[PDB]
Amino acid sequence: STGSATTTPIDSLDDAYITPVQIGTPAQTLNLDFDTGSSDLWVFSSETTASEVDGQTIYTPSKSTTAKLLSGATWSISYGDGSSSSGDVYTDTVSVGGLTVTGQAVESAKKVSSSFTEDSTIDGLLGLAFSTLNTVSPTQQKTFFDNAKASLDSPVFTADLGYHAPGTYNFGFIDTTAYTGSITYTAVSTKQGFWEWTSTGYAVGSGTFKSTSIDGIADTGTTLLYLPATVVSAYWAQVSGAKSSSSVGGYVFPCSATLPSFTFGVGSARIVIPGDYIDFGPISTGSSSCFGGIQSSAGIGINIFGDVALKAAFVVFNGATTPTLGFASK
Numbered sequence: 001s002t003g004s005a006t007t008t009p010i011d012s013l014d015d016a017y018i019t020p021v022q023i024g025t026p027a028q029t030l031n032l033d034f035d036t037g038s039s040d041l042w043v044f045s046s047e048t049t050a051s052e053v054d055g056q057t058i059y060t061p062s063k064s065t066t067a068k069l070l071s072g073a074t075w076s077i078s079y080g081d082g083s084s085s086s087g088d089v090y091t092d093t094v095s096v097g098g099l100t101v102t103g104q105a106v107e108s109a110k111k112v113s114s115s116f117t118e119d120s121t122i123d124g125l126l127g128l129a130f131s132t133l134n135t136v137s138p139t140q141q142k143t144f145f146d147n148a149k150a151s152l153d154s155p156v157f158t159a160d161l162g163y164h165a166p167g168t169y170n171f172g173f174i175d176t177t178a179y180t181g182s183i184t185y186t187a188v189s190t191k192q193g194f195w196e197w198t199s200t201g202y203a204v205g206s207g208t209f210k211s212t213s214i215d216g217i218a219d220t221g222t223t224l225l226y227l228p229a230t231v232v233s234a235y236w237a238q239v240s241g242a243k244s245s246s247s248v249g250g251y252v253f254p255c256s257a258t259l260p261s262f263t264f265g266v267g268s269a270r271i272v273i274p275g276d277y278i279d280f281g282p283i284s285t286g287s288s289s290c291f292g293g294i295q296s297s298a299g300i301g302i303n304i305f306g307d308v309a310l311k312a313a314f315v316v317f318n319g320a321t322t323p324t325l326g327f328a329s330k
Contacts, residue, residue, distance in 0.1 A: 001099055001100075001148075001151045001152055001153065001172060002098070002099060002152065002153055002170070002171060002172035002173045003095075003096045003097035003098045003099025003148075003170070003171040003172065004097040004098065004168060004169075004170045004171070005019050005020065005021075005096050005097030005168070005169050006019070006020075006097075006166050006167070006168055007019040007034065007159075007161065007162075007166065007167050007168060007169050008166045009162065009164065009165070009166070010119070010121040010122065011121070012164070012281075013280055013281055014161075014162075014163065014164060014223070014307060014311065015223050016033050016119075016121075016122065016221070016223060016307075017033065017034070017161060017167070017220070017307070018031040018032065018033060018121060018122060018123075019031065019032055019033075019034050019096070019097075019126070019169055020032075021094060021095070021096055021126060022093075022094065022095040022096075023043070023059050023064070023092055023093070023094050023106055024059065024061070024063070024064030024065075024066060024067055024092050024093060025064055025065045025066040025092075025093060026064075027095070028057075028059055028060065028063070028064065029057070030043055030044070030057050030058075030059060030123035030124055031057065031121065031122065031123045032122070032123060032124050032125060032126040033122050033124070033125045033126070033221060034125075034126050034128055034159075034169055034220055034221070035125050035126065035127050035128060035129070035219070035220060035221030036128040036129055036159070036194075036195055036217075036218055036219055036220040036221065036317060037080075037129055037194060037217060037219035037220070037221045037222060037304075038077065038079065038125060038127040038129055038133060038221060039127040039128075039129045039130060039131055039132070039133035039134040039135075039143050039193065040075060040077055040107050040125065040127045040133075040134055040135055040136070041094070041104065041105065041106060041107060041124070041125065041126045041127055041143065041144055042075065042077070042085055042087070042106075042107035042108070042109055042124050042125055043058070043059040043106060043107070043108060043109065043123060043124035044056040044057065044058045044059065044109055044112070044116075044123050044124055045058050045059045045060065045061070045087070045108040045109055046058055046059070046060040046061070046062065046108075047087060047088065047108050047109070047110050048087075048108075048109045048110060048111070048112060049110065049111055049112075052111065052112050052116075052117045053117065054117050054118065054120055055120030056120060056122070056123045057123045058123070059106065059108065059123075059124075061090045061092065061106075061108065064092055066092050066093045066102075067090045067091070067092045067106075068090060068091050068092070069088070069089075069090055070088075070089040070090060070091055070105065070136075070139075070141075072138065073088060073089035073105075073136050073137065073138070073139060073141075074086070074087070074088055074089070074136070074137055075087060075088075075089060075107045075135045075136045075137065076135055077135045079221075080222070080300065080304075081115070081222075082113075082115075083113045083114075083115040083116060084112075084113045085109045085111060085112040085113065085116060086109065086110060086111050087107060087108045087109045087110035087111065088107075088108055088110065089105055089106070089107050089108065089136055089141070090105075090106045090108055091103045091104060091105055091106065092104060092106045094106065094144060096126075096144065096169070096171065097169070097170075097171065099148055099152075099171050099172065101144055101147045101148050103147070104144055104147055105134075105136060105141035105142070107136065107141075109124070125221065126144060127143050127144075128143060128144070128145055128157065128220070128317065129143070129193055129194055129195065130143075130146075130190050130193045130194070131143050131146045132190075132193045133193035133194075145157055145171070145317075145319060146319075148171060148172075149319055151172075152171060152172030153172045153173055154172055154173060154174070155172075155318070155319045155320055156171075156172065156173070156174065156316055156317060156318050156319060156320075157169060157170060157171045157172070157317050157319070158170045158174060158175070158178075158314065158315060158316050158317065159220055159310055159314075159315045159317065160175075160178055160179075160314050160315070160330070161220070161307055161310055161311035162311060163274075163276070163277055163311050163312075167311070174316060178314050178330060179313075179314035179328035179329065179330040180328065180329050180330055181328060181329055182269075182328065183314070183316055183326040183327065183328040184266045184267045184268070184269035184326065184327055184328070185267075185316070185318070185324045185325065185326045186198070186266050186267055186324065186325050186326070186327070187324060188323045188324050188325055190323060192217075192302075194217040194218075194219070194302075195217055195218040195219075195317060195323070195325055196215065196216070196217050197215070197216070197217075197218065197325050198213050198214065198215050198216075199213070199214040199215075199216065199264050199265050199266065199305075200212075200213065200214075200265030200266065200267060200268070201213075201214070201264070201265040202214070202227075202231055202262065202263060202264050202265065203262070203263040203270075204234055204235050204238050204260055204261075204262060204263075205238055205260030205261055205262075205275075206260075207238075209263065209265070209270070211265075214227065214228065214231070214264075214303055215302075215303060216297075216302065216303030216304055216305050217302060217303070217304055217305065218305050218310060218315060218317070218325055219304050219305060219306050219310075220306075220307065220310060221306075222304045222306030222307065223280075223293075223306055223307050223308070224280070224293050224294070224295050224304075224306050224307070224308050225262075225273070225278075225293060225294045225295070225304070225305060225306055225308040225309045226295050226296065226297035226300055226303055226304040226306065227294065227295075227296070227297055227303050228296070228297060228298070228303065229296045229297075229298045232251065232294055232295060232296045235260070235262055235294050236251050236253065236292065236294070238260050239253045239257050239259060239260070240254070240257065241253060241254040241257065242254075242257070242292070244296075245289075248283050248289075248291070250291065250292060250295045250296070251291075251292035251294070251295060251296075252283060252289045252290060252291055252292060253289070253290055253292055254288065254289065254290070255281075255282060255287075255288045255289065255290040256288070257290075258275065259275030259276065259278045259279055260275050261273055261274050261275050262275075262278065262294060264305075264309060266327040269327065271309070271312050271313045271327055271329060272312060272329070273308060273309060273312040274312070277293060277308055277311065277312060278292060278293035278294055278308060279292075279293065280292065280293050293308040294308065312329075312330075313327045313328060313329065313330065314327070314328040314329075314330045315327055316328075
């Protein structure tokens with residue numbers, strides 16, 4: 001089997017991407033944030049504290065003839081950005097772009113933190129990291145991909161995120177028309193539960209490539225590119241007037257600037273992030289100070305190849321017995 005679904009930016013900045021997901025019978029379609037940095041499929045629901053729902057579409061398990069309470073199961077998650085959610089668990093039928101999994105754990109939120117409530121466009125998350133990170137207790141549950149894998153034509157999914165435009169998540173096949181050149185594959189460590197890999201280096205603008213190993217995670221659920229402070233300083237040093245602002249919480253730059261590109265290495269291959277992808281607009285409405293899309297990972301504890309990086313590539317998440325990651329230009 002295969003599936004193919006369009007993923008759409010939530011706003012004009014590409015702060016996140018939403019993908020429609022069918023849950024239950026008859027289908028209830030929710031727009032979920034596909035997150036290769038976590039492993040829970042959780043949704044706003046009829047059980048969510050009413051004051052914490054503001055415009056989201058909810059899953060109502062009582063209206064699904066295929067929903068079954070997973071007795072005794074609870075979940076609770078906290079994300080790298082400080083947000084969180086928790087609740088109980090149903091199993092139900094879940095379909096993404098024509099690919100159907102029966103008996104998928106659908107984690108129903110009883111509580112969500114403010115940042116989720118405040119984002120009306122995201123109805124929940126669909127985790128695509130390794131199932132070892134799944135938070136369901138006392139019986140850990142499998143991700144949608146893990147459940148689908150054996151049925152797929154090939155045990156892979158691909159992320160093709162757009163810049164200021166829709167893109168695609170495919171399951172079970174590589175669309176060879178979706179990228180240019182060849183796909184370069186690179187080793188993955190699953191020891192922390194992430195799609196963790198090592199970039200071979202970077203360049204700033206038309207500058208020379210610096211060969212250096214940069215361990216990090218491919219994370220569709222993180223907006224920005226978080227890299228070591230040395231690398232980030234080298235980038236922003238090429239932007240007149242850019243500075244790290246402790247009050248804002250990162251590098252800012254004059255909105256009048258033209259940003260240089262940023263290149264990262266995948267083996268001997270190179271992925272070029274155009275400068276415009278690195279502009280996240282005014283820090284507050286009407287400001288002429290703009291927020292940068294490349295930020296320091298210092299104090300996160302890990303480097304994160306988030307959407308800023310991934311959207312410059314066609315990315316293969318290869319879930320073979322020994323997983324790997326592939327990157328192609330597009």
